[PDB]
Amino acid sequence: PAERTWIFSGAELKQAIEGKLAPDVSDPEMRRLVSVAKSSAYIAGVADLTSGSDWCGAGAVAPHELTDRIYTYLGDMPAEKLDEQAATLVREALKVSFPCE
Amino acid sequence: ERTWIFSGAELKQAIEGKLAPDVSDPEMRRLVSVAKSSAYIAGVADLTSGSDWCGAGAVAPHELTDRIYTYLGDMPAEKLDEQAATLVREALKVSFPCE
Amino acid sequence: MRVNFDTLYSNYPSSDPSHPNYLSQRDLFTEIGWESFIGNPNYHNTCAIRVSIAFVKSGINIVPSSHRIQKGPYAGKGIEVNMRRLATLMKRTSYLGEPDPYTPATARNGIGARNGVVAFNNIPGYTGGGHIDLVRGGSEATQCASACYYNSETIWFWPLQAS
Amino acid sequence: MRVNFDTLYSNYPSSDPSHPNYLSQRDLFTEIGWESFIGNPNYHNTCAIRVSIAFVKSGINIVPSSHRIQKGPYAGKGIEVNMRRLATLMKRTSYLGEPDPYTPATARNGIGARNGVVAFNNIPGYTGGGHIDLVRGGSEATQCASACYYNSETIWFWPLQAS
């Protein structure tokens, strides 16, 4: 607890997905576009790395659909898990929403 | 056969500030492009921290981007059509090796 | 065919949690009575469902259609689930007619300050038809209601508003 | 001490490949004769080296300093490698004096249209004390030469230009 090494926590990713993680940007609509660009790209990093193994559908699911399923998972899970590194939460969300068989 | 969201070439273009054609101001285009490359790199870095590379919690995030960019430029050009995430993991292993 | 863009947009359920009209796949499918398709891999891609619903709720039925709304005030109305088939239908003179075709390097200045329907055809890394959405042109950027895919081969724009 | 911001900025080597003054760690360390530190984990974080070099090349020596330039026209000039120690030095009345302290929610409007030196203090996961950089205030965003860290606890701004 506050011994963190990760660049995004679950809480920071969720705030980016919601359009509220670019305080350096002046226009509120640009702030939203930048925030969502960060969350989409963070999710893409984890998705691309794990497509073989942890989840299935990489060639046939639109990237923004991943964000929708990750967001519902981040909201459904207990609130204290948001202090964890975001990437393991994204991998968990993808496994649950796009399981391999 | 391409299923990945970013190729090596697309990540390298984002790092260079040239992957946001939906954005009007050229300085905003650069800021958005770099935000995408930083965050993609962060996703791979956070997931692979302590298994493939060492220095998470010490090394400033933007320093990772500098080492990844030099790796993407040094490597054979045909590897840029590969998924970016495996290239980032390779770059981190080389620049921030563990034992 | 005449459509008020502000009416169409007000009726559009977005897949973007940042958007005022966000509705998750789980909630979208519940509203229209498709609970049994939630997490069925044939129904992951919701873009053409979301655009179909915007039209239906604005009093414009989607005919022909692959599917129907099974519940609520719009039970029986048509939904096209396939982005390619919906883009084809929109192209008909009885719907939106011929769109303005663009490329990634031209779509932002092409759309300009105009609002309308947009189709991103053949997206790199995605084997689906592509993405269909509503777009607002602005000074700073194009803003799609759910997502923009300028990495696409061609972009079709149907203008409905200029402001 | 007065320094021309345009001179300081023109002399700054950026770690951002998108930036016109980009110089990789490998090239930065070669220019100053520190080739033997490339990939030494005590030298991973280059922010205070890059700001030290901008000052030295603008005719402002960093005194005292942890290290010295070992090669070229600026051989023997001081480099502070530690971001916390450089921020402390800049605070002295002999250098830039007391900065304007801000918070993440206030730093963008606080900086405004001003240009200067910025310190992002206490970033989660970033050793050496934080990030120090050059910043240009604009209408659209703050632009740091290398990186901005508004996730920091406090932000110090030293204005040098208002344009």
Residue numbers in the entry:
A (entry chain A): 0 to 100
B (entry chain B): 2 to 100
C (entry chain C), D (entry chain D): 1 to 163
From the manuscript:
The type VI secretion systems (T6SSs) of Gram-negative bacteria inject various toxic effectors into the periplasmic or cytoplasmic space of the target cells and induce cell lysis of enemy cells. Tai1, Tai2, Tai3 and Tai4 neutralize the endogenous toxic effectors Tae1, Tae2, Tae3 and Tae4, respectively. To gain insight into the Tae4 family proteins, we determined the crystal structures of Tai4 and of the Tae4–Tai4 complex from Agrobacterium tumefaciens at 1.55 and 1.9 Å resolution, respectively.
The structure revealed that the AtTai4 dimer binds two AtTae4 molecules to form a heterotetramer in the asymmetric unit, which is consistent with the size-exclusion chromatography results indicating that the AtTae4–AtTai4 complex exists in a heterotetrameric form in solution. Pro47, Asp48 and Val49 in the loop of AtTai4 form hydrogen bonds to Arg108, Thr142 and Arg108 in the other AtTae4 protomer in the asymmetric unit, respectively. Thus, these specific interactions between AtTae4 and AtTai4 may contribute towards stabilizing the formation of the AtTae4–AtTai4 complex. A structural comparison of AtTai4 with SmTai4 showed that AtTai4 contains more extended helices and loops, which may enforce the interaction between AtTai4 and the adjacent AtTae4. While there is no direct interaction between the potentially catalytic His131 of AtTae4 and Ala86 of AtTai4, which corresponds to Gln84 of SmTai4, the structural comparison suggests that AtTai4 effectively neutralizes the activity of AtTae4 by blocking the entrance to its substrate-binding pocket. The growth inhibition of E. coli DH10B owing to the expression of AtTae4 was rescued by the co-expression of AtTai4. A structural superimposition highlighted the differences in the spatial arrangement of the aspartic acid residue in the catalytic triad (Cys–His–Asp) among the Tae4 family proteins.
